[PDB]
Design a protein around this ligand. Sequence first.
Ligand code: CGJ
Length: 210
Amino acid sequence: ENLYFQGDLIVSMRILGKKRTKTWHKGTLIAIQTVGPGKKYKVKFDNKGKSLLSGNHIAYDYHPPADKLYVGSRVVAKYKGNQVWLYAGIVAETPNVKNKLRFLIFFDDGYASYVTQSELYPICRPLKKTWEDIEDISCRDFIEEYVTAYPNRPMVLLKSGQLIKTEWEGTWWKSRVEEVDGSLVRILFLDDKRCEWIYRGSTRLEPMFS
Ligand SMILES: Cc1nnc2n1-c1ccccc1COC2
């Protein structure tokens, strides 16, 4: 059937849709379709191109209220070289004193960042197990364990200057802790002389792996 209304969604509304590139873009909801128990949402992107999307691949074009964001909530967030995209992830932390009132996001590709409320958008129809549409099995299983074990979160305590081994492309590299920010650590890879922010509970940090 063709619907005009479905839950709080209405045909003609502005919305965000996931493109094939895996980045999210503004568009208009032009149709809602049912096929038995299933629902699909037709989006016309601002470039005139159209996709027929599952409800976990559209997001509201507003910032979620804080009382609607939980650990494990499925969101689209602002993602950082010198460019900014909108990319899907999972809420890992909500605002508290220790994180300076920010949200910790674990993005689907394995990146992590702190963001503000104004950098988040809620996915319209998240899966019951919100991690189940994370493409990479290793990423997906990590999130399942993290979200379900929460608030039990083993983490390594690290200090600036500390020498550790950090994983990259499947092997261990000599690295140094450059700075710490809440549950994230900035690691300098010593051979390459570039940095990455990594979650302190990541098994990419050799002390966590052990
Ligand atoms: C693996 C892994 N180790 N620490 C993290 N992850 C992860 C899994 C899935 C999505 C995002 C991340 C990155 O931040 C959290």
